[PDB]
């Protein structure tokens with residue numbers, strides 16, 4: 001039960017920035033469908049005064065990744081990154097956006 005609070009579909013990059021900058025917690029994120037690369041996904045994460053963007057890559061076997069570790073789904077990529085940093089230079093952990101029912 002309950003849909004994932006992180007899939008925003010074709011929400012533009014600048015609109016993801018605007019929405020996430022208003023979030024209080026560092027790590028508040030969303031997965032969006034890219035406009036610069038049709039058919040691809042992008043990860044937008046809040047961290048301080050910035051909203052960082054990551055490109056969700058896909059190999060020949062259809063597995064998703066950001067760096068080296070491969071995942072069979074976007075769901076597994078997201079979940080893994082809730083406890084392992086999405087960034088190499090900084091320690092950024094993904095946590096669901098604060099939504100009101």
Ligand SMILES: CC[C@H](C)[C@H](NC(=O)[C@H]1[C@H](C(=O)NC)[C@@H]1c1ccc(OP(=O)(O)O)cc1)C(=O)N[C@@H](CC(N)=O)C(N)=O
Pocket residue numbers: 013033034035036037042043052053054055056057065066067087088
């Ligand atoms: C500071 C946040 C990241 C640590 C940084 N982001 C970056 O290097 C982002 C660059 C960027 O944002 N250039 C403008 C690239 C990007 C480019 C396009 C995107 O899709 P759309 O166009 O926003 O829908 C998403 C990310 C990075 O090292 N990313 C790695 C890992 C990754 N998979 O993005 C990379 N560039 O391979």
